[PDB]
Amino acid sequence: SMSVPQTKAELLLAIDKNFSKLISYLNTIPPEITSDKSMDGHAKGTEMSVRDLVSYLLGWNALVVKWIASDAKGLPVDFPETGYKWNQLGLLAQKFYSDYSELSYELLVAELQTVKNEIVNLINDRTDDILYGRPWYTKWTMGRMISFNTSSPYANANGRLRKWAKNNNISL
Ligand SMILES: [Ca+2]
Ligand SMILES: [Ca+2]
Ligand SMILES: [Cl-]
Ligand code: NA
């Protein structure tokens, strides 16, 4: 649907559309301002930087790749992550923050592009039946696990960046 992809084609489209927009925004923003803690954060009342936002996106995108790739190698997978429950997603996002705290904006953007390319490759190697035809992780399809961690967060990031750019001298 327009809300949540329900086919392989829709998933690829949402990724392509939302990521193309995101990368256009990330390539526009002067890197010199990407450490200002001037964006509203995920939890209300917090603040984050553009670099921090890229770090959060990278963590979710790397995670879904790790789930799929590890499963495909016949390895057990902890969801959402080893040591975390599904009601600890803020805590998990803070792991990403620490994981990537010393990485530059430029390296983060490059890494995000790399893992986005890898998720597209994983999708391309599969079919609609694999992605949407049956459950994969408990009640959820693989395709939904992918959009939940890629196209949906990309679109949220795009909206956050549009709002922020209005107060930071950036047209986009
Ligand atoms: Ca903001
Ligand atoms: Ca505050
Ligand atoms: Cl989703
Ligand atoms: Na989906």
Residue numbers in the entry: 0 to 171
From the paper:
The precursor PdDfsB is cleaved by subtilisin to yield biologically active Slf, and the chemical gradients of both proteins between two growing colonies could be accurately modelled. However, remarkably, the dfsB gene is widely distributed across Gram-positive and to some extent Gram-negative bacterial kingdoms (PFAM entry DUF1706). PdDfsB adopts a four-helical bundle core structure that belongs to the DinB structural superfamily. The most strongly conserved region of PdDfsB is the C-terminal helix, which is present within the mature Slf sequence.
The second, related clade contains DfsB homologues from mainly Gram-negative bacteria, again including many pathogens. We were able to express, purify and obtain crystal structures for DfsB homologues from Clostridium difficile 630 and Escherichia coli UTI89, as well as of IRC4 from S. cerevisiae. For the purposes of clarity, we refer to the first two proteins as CdDfsB and EcDfsB, respectively; however, we have no evidence that they are truly acting as DfsB homologues by undergoing cleavage and release of their analogous Slf “toxin”. The overall structures of CdDfsB, EcDfsB and IRC4 are identical with that of PdDfsB, with strong conservation of overall topology and surface charge, particularly in the C-terminal helix.
